[PDB]
Every structure is written in structure tokens, then in C-alpha cells.
Ligand binder design. Sequence first.
Ligand SMILES: Nc1ncnc2c1ncn2[C@@H]1O[C@H](CSCC[C@H](N)C(=O)O)[C@@H](O)[C@H]1O
Ligand SMILES: CC(C)=CCC/C(C)=C/COP(=O)(O)OP(=O)(O)O
Ligand SMILES: [Mg+2]
Length: 277
Amino acid sequence: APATPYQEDIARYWNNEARPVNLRLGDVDGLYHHHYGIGPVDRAALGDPEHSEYEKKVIAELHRLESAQAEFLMDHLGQAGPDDTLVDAGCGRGGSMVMAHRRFGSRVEGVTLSAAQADFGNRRARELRIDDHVRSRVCNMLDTPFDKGAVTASWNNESTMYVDLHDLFSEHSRFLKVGGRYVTITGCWNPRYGQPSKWVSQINAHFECNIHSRREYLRAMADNRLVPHTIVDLTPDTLPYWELRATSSLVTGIEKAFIESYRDGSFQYVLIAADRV
Ligand SMILES: Nc1ncnc2c1ncn2[C@@H]1O[C@H](CSCC[C@H](N)C(=O)O)[C@@H](O)[C@H]1O
Ligand SMILES: CC(C)=CCC/C(C)=C/COP(=O)(O)OP(=O)(O)O
Ligand SMILES: [Mg+2]
């Protein structure tokens, strides 16, 4: 049962979603992501733009940048081991969960509003024989079954724009143990610009999301016992990904809005890593 008419919309969006730009990239190595990439493009791997196999090399390179984004996130989760539980809030098809389990060996619990995504991720976990440690469930990340203080580290990778931040960080704060770690990577509108620009609103309209101001992230964390130890503006680092994507046959139409808004300073891609204290 959906929490709100809006979360019903979001369950529906993601139950229906199945774009080539996500699935073809995932097929590269069975890590299915729904987030963007960071880091320099590997021009040597790409080769000659005129070559017959170029679109496939671009696919492989975009995927590499998306996986690199997740590795950067996990660099900030502190240490974690097989006895620990990690929570992926808004877990998509579960690519980040597989990566986390591989890296840390932890139990990894994911929650998503999409039954299709949860099924897909659990089928993937079974194929990899890691289903005894990695599990996706259909659940509102604002209201989860995890016990108070049970969780060692958790994160939101491009999923914070679908929820009230105070309610979100309240919940992470509840299930994270004292000394626990939280990380988000998000696109937020830059309070320096003043208000959400037209580009930001176009992005909101495209995904049915609600991009928050960087000011709102910091405030919501301060009000919920999450204290940032690292904040990185990844805007420069994600532009190469988007500029390459823009040349791809798998474009979705929103590429210009991300590029222009990143360039004019109205929109930014940030990582915030915080301690639960
Ligand atoms: N209230 C809510 N509760 C649980 N998941 C939510 C949610 N609102 C949005 N989501 C999830 O957020 C995801 C956005 S896509 C990002 C997926 C994943 N974090 C990745 O990086 O690959 C979708 O899985 C969507 O179902
Ligand atoms: C940084 C921000 C504001 C993301 C907005 C929310 C959202 C739907 C991310 C999904 O990426 P995706 O892999 O599902 O979509 P795409 O097909 O455009 O790559
Ligand atoms: Mg994508």
C-alpha cells in the first residue's frame, strides 16, 4: 500500500521504466545502475569515432563512469565487514548493492518503491549466489523495518529528490548506530543562484522529482544528528560523462538541461558524507 498519492506515482514511474540507456549499460557487466557518472573519459578505450564498434565502446565507457560514481560513494562509508548491515535507501535495480557486498562482505538491505526493481535485483542476487546477504524489498525509505541503531552505514544515491529531507534524515538517523555513517550523492539546486532555474524545473518535470536546495540538505542533516565530514562539489567531475552521453544514440532528451544548468551554476552534483553522532 502506497504511503501517498505521490509515492504511488513514483512506484508507477519505476515499475514502468526500462530505457536502453540504463539496461544496455547494465548488460556490460551485470551491474544495473540508475545514476550518473564521474571522472575523465578514457579516450583511448573509445578509439576512432568512425569505427564500426564505437557506440558499444561509448556504452562501455559511460557504464564505467557510472560504476566509478558508486565506488566514490562507498569510499566514504568508512569500514564495514561481514558482521555489519548496510542500507541502500532507494535501491533501484540493485547494482550498488552488489558492489557494496563485494567490497565489504556486509549484509546489504535495499528498499525501493518498485516491485519490478526489487524482483530484478533479487533475481540478480540469486544468479550471483549472494542472495543470502543482499536483499531488496518494496518499502517506503521514510518508514523502514530496520531496528533503531541496527545499521552500520547507509546511503541515498540519486534518490533524495523524491522525499522530504527532514523525514528522510530522521529515518536514517533512527536506524544508524551511533558512530554510523551516511552518504548521499545528489543533484541539488545551488542556493547561490537564488531559486530553482528553468533547467532545474525541466529536470523535475522529466522525472516527477523535487530537487532540493543544497541549503536544505545541510539544514535537514543538522536537525537530525547527521554531521557532514566531507562535502565535494562533483559538478566538474560529472560534466565529461554528460557531454559524452549527449553524443550517444541512447540520449533521453534531458541532457541539455543537466549540461546548461551545471554550466550556469543553477544546479550542482554533490557528495555529502556525514557521521551519525
Ligand atoms: N519514498 C521512497 N522509498 C523507497 N525508494 C524510493 C522512494 N522514492 C524513490 N525511491 C527509489 O529511488 C530510486 C531512484 S533511481 C536510483 C537507484 C539507485 N539508488 C542507484 O543509484 O542505482 C528508485 O529505485 C525509486 O524506487
Ligand atoms: C541527479 C538527479 C536530479 C537525478 C534525478 C532523479 C532520477 C530519476 C535519477 C535516475 O537516473 P536514471 O538512470 O533512472 O535516468 P536516465 O535514463 O536519465 O539516465
Ligand atoms: Mg542512467
